[PDB]
Design a protein around this ligand. Structure first.
Ligand SMILES: NC(=O)c1ccc[n+]([C@@H]2O[C@H](COP(=O)([O-])OP(=O)(O)OC[C@H]3O[C@@H](n4cnc5c(N)ncnc54)[C@H](OP(=O)(O)O)[C@@H]3O)[C@@H](O)[C@H]2O)c1
Ligand SMILES: Nc1nc(=O)c2nc(CNc3ccc(C(=O)N[C@@H](CCC(=O)O)C(=O)O)cc3)cnc2[nH]1
Ligand SMILES: [Mn+2]
Ligand SMILES: [Mn+2]
Ligand SMILES: [Mn+2]
Ligand SMILES: [Mn+2]
Length: 159
């Protein structure tokens, strides 16, 4: 099973200038809980944005060019990325925009954080047809001293 996980600001913005400009520790904690002990697939730009391997997860990087770091696994196509995960229950696709576009048709589950923040950005999460997806979990949180925007954790499953 393939799942996508992402945090979306207003208008589905996910990034600007290869970075995420906000800081929401509660959302990063949610990201870690939902990805630990699972393979994670990311595109090369997201790998450069994170800047290091994510511990406790098999890190698989999509790139058309040869890899440049043997602490992670490099693959050259979507099918190779999936195969390199092996026989696991859940593969997590962690972006970015181009990678989400390619894996959305193959995904059964979306873990989405909706952040109440207006962000100029240059990367968006794909338009997803709402009729295809059922919301199975949602949890709203107001802003607090650690998290400067309100946010909503949602899990959607393909109908
Ligand atoms: N808010 C969030 O949840 C979230 C999550 C992830 C990322 N982001 C943000 O998203 C942005 C990066 O997204 P992006 O769309 O620019 O880039 P991306 O999807 O991270 O990476 C694109 C790169 O991945 C490689 N790639 C993708 N598909 C491939 C395929 N089928 N075969 C081979 N290689 C493939 C290519 O690398 P080569 O050029 O080397 O061939 C391509 O240039 C950053 O701003 C980041 O901060 C946000
Ligand atoms: N909901 C969500 N939030 C994100 O920030 C996010 N980020 C990415 C890609 N970028 C990043 C950037 C940093 C870290 C990171 O530092 N993660 C640590 C944080 C642990 C914690 O804060 O509790 C990790 O071990 O996962 C992860 C992904 C993909 N999907 C996401 N999905
Ligand atoms: Mn092929
Ligand atoms: Mn198999
Ligand atoms: Mn949203
Ligand atoms: Mn806000």
């Amino acid at each position: 099973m393939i799942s996508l996980i992402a945090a979306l600001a207003v208008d589905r913005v996910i990034g600007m200038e290869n970075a995420m400009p906000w800081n929401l520790p509660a959302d990063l904690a949610w990201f870690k809980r939902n990805t630990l002990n699972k393979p994670v697939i990311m595109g090369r730009h997201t790998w450069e944005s994170i800047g290091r391997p994510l511990p406790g997860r098999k890190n698989i990087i999509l790139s058309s060019q040869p890899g440049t770091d043997d602490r992670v696994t490099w693959v050259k196509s979507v099918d190779e990325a999936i195969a390199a995960c092996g026989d696991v229950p859940e593969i997590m696709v962690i972006g970015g925009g181009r990678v989400y576009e390619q894996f959305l048709p193959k995904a059964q589950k979306l873990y989405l954080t909706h952040i109440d923040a207006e962000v100029e950005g240059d990367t968006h999460f794909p338009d997803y047809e709402p009729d295809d997806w059922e919301s199975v979990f949602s949890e709203f949180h107001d802003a607090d001293a650690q998290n400067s925007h309100s946010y909503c954790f949602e899990i959607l499953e393909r109908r």
